Design a protein around this ligand. Structure first.
Ligand code: NI
Ligand code: NI
Ligand code: NI
Ligand code: ZN
Length: 351
């Protein structure tokens, strides 16, 4: 098929839009899907050199991180579970001082591959603190291109129709990283897209599994964490499960890796599992968004059943507006639509 022939290896693509292509966010997402980018589950977008979301970051030392998290990781042989210990609130200044202190700072290395090895060898030692899930934005108010606080996708129909805001989902979160802080394997809530911008600092490294092969990763995880799988139908949404690339290779789980540098965007795609770690002191901004293609994913998303993860978006408004011919069938539990993960979103048609 046409869609199966684009990005058949499902490798992470990188894009360098001109400023004109960059100005319309939804349109460029459809463009990159027209090139097959979504099949990897993760794409890099390098914005125009001339583009900046903020003039400088010297004025945020006193910004409050209300709920920094000490990440205690337990496990062996490439399989781990991360436990969160909430610490007292601290300022960015205080967090940076700890991040760069001898106790916590990035180790010496040459090739990225050496640091990656250090991460997987040491992630259960000297537990770091992640300044995670901070409500806010570092964008200056007048930036209209790729502004994470107002992307103007159809996800906006949630708030527009019901008034409902979901922090970190249709509002932005900031993430202040230090060396060895991690994000465990997950797809987004409701299997949405996400956008992730690295404002400043040391890199953030990513792993991704193609959406068309996500079930393979799920089978592995349920097998190796049989307890969790008994207790929750979607325990990866707890964002506690870490799995090394050597473990993925040993069991034939397809994946790709990429390192995100300061001033680059990463896009995750519906049902794209991703995980990664920070190289050192840094700050990223993230939120979710949608396209028309997402609607079927939202209908079919398998949600956390154990109440640990509470985020649930009502799909009824999307099905009525965009799938009127299937609405009554869907309400009756008889909509057997199957997702073809290779297809690009319909807005991509013009390309
Ligand atoms: Ni394949
Ligand atoms: Ni994510
Ligand atoms: Ni297979
Ligand atoms: Zn659960």
């Amino acid at each position: 098929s046409e869609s199966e022939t684009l990005n058949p290896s499902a490798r992470i693509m990188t894009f360098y839009p001109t400023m004109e292509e960059f100005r319309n966010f939804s349109r460029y997402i459809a463009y990159i899907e027209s090139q097959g980018a979504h099949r990897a589950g993760l794409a890099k977008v390098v914005p125009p050199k001339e583009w900046k979301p903020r003039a400088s970051y010297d004025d945020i030392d006193d910004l409050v991180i209300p709920a920094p998290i000490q990440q205690l990781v337990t496990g062996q042989s490439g399989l781990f579970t991360q436990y969160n210990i909430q610490k007292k609130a601290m300022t960015v200044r205080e967090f940076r001082k700890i991040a760069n202190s001898d106790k916590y700072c990035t180790p010496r290395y040459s090739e990225f591959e050496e640091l990656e090895r250090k991460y997987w060898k040491n992630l259960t030692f000297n537990p770091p603190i992640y300044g995670a899930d901070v409500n806010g934005t570092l964008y200056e108010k007048h930036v209209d291109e790729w502004n994470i606080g107002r992307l103007r996708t159809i996800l906006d129909l949630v708030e527009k129709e019901s008034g409902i805001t979901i922090e970190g989902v249709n509002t932005p979160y900031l993430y202040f990283g230090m060396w060895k802080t991690s994000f465990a394997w997950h797809t987004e809530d409701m299997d949405l897209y996400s956008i992730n911008y690295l404002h400043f600092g040391e890199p953030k490294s990513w792993y991704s599994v193609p959406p068309e092969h996500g079930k393979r990763l799920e089978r592995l995880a349920k097998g190796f964490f049989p307890g969790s799988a008994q207790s929750c139908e979607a325990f990866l949404r707890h964002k506690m499960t870490l799995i090394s690339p050597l473990m993925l290779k040993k069991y034939g789980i397809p994946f790709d890796k990429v390192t995100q540098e300061a001033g680059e965007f990463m896009i995750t795609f519906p049902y794209g599992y991703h995980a990664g770690f920070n190289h050192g002191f840094n700050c990223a901004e993230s939120t979710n968004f949608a396209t028309r293609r997402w609607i079927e994913y939202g209908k079919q998303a398998v949600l956390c059943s154990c109440r640990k993860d509470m985020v649930k978006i009502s799909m009824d408004v999307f099905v009525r507006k965009f799938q009127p011919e299937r609405y009554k069938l869907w309400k009756a539990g008889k909509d057997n639509t199957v997702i073809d993960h290779t297809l690009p979103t319909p807005e991509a048609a013009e390309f």
